[PDB]
């Protein structure tokens, strides 16, 4: 049976909530438990009425994200195909009740400072169900770090980390992320000089440049285990393919072209498309604290430019990681 909000958010945890993100169907908060930050994603489910102008999702509709979140989190503890590049999943609960007054307070503070596109979540009744996903706190999204990175050497570590994580997930799970825009890439400081992964039993390292990248958000993602495929069928979606004003919105169309609008199939080229979009952001929209002033830094810039103009001729993140000159 469902639990009260108190189960996920005891008082001290609830009292420490700050809102960090939102979308059509959810709210994301940061809080603290045992001296450690975590991120809480809260989705209303199963009700007949509108939230932020759209119908609530059913449990069936959210289940794929729950499943995929868990499978990708478990890659940190695997052997042949091992990566910590996906966000850790701590717990998932089904909760019943009105929205806590303490979360409303957090919601109000975000609306005052950043502005919300969503309704104030104060209208839910005591029978309302929610899914509450608790994750590792992954740092700050790449979009919000547009003006905050040291140099293009950092961008290279970020791209290498992303390619490796995706390669490991391809190998283990026939994974496609399918929505890896720059709000779904998180950066956190790390003291580790290098990060470790294992791809089909071969272990390697990546220089961190002081950052650990985490991938999040699996609403559009696809994977499989023992031939059972978990994915989001967007073949009849009326607006996913009609966006404009950012290369991001072309990627949805280019995915649909690659897969012939058959979303259950495996087309790991979609991971390449997203990595090309990310590289394009690094070269065009990111602005660095230190530019490429030295010949050595101009060289890194040239290698990332070369990656950008060649990577679309690779068939998967695995092909990119194993064969592309950038990662030698």
């Amino acid at each position: 049976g469902p639990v009260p909000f108190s189960h996920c958010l005891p008082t001290e945890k609830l009292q420490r909530c700050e809102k960090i993100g939102e979308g059509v169907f959810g709210e994301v908060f940061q809080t603290i438990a045992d001296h450690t930050p975590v991120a809480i994603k809260i989705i209303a489910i199963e009700g007949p009425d509108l939230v932020n102008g759209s119908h609530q999702k059913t449990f069936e509709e959210i289940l794929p994200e729950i499943i995929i979140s868990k499978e990708l989190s478990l890659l940190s503890g695997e052997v042949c195909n091992r990566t910590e590049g996906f966000i850790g999943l701590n717990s998932v609960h089904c909760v019943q009740g009105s929205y806590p007054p303490l979360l409303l307070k957090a919601w109000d503070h975000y609306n005052s400072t950043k502005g919300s596109a969503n309704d104030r979540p104060d209208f839910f009744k005591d029978d309302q169900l929610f899914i509450v996903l608790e994750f590792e706190f992954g740092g700050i999204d790449l979009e919000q770090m547009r003006t905050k990175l040291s140099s293009l050497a950092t961008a290279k570590s970020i791209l290498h980390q992303l390619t490796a994580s995706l390669a490991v997930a391809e190998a283990s799970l026939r994974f496609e992320h399918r929505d890896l825009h720059w709000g779904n890439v998180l950066l956190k400081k790390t003291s580790l000089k290098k990060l470790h992964y294992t791809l089909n039993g071969k272990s390697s390292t990546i220089p961190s440049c002081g950052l650990q990248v985490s991938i999040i958000d699996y609403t559009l993602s696809r994977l499989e285990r023992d031939g059972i495929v978990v994915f989001c069928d967007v073949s009849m979606d009326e607006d996913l393919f009609t966006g404009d004003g950012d290369y991001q919105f072309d990627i949805y169309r280019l995915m649909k072209k690659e897969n012939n609008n058959r979303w259950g199939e495996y087309h790991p080229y979609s991971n390449v498309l997203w990595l090309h979009y990310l590289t394009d952001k690094m070269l065009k929209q990111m602005t660095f604290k230190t530019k490429c002033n030295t010949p050595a830094m101009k060289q890194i810039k040239r290698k990332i430019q070369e990656f950008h103009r060649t990577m679309l001729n690779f068939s998967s993140a695995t092909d990119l990681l194993c064969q592309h000159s950038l990662f030698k």
Binding site: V24, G53, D179, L240, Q248, Y252
Partner: peptide, 7 residues
Amino acid sequence: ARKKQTA
């Protein structure tokens, strides 16, 4: 941006 927006 989010893939779908409120909106």
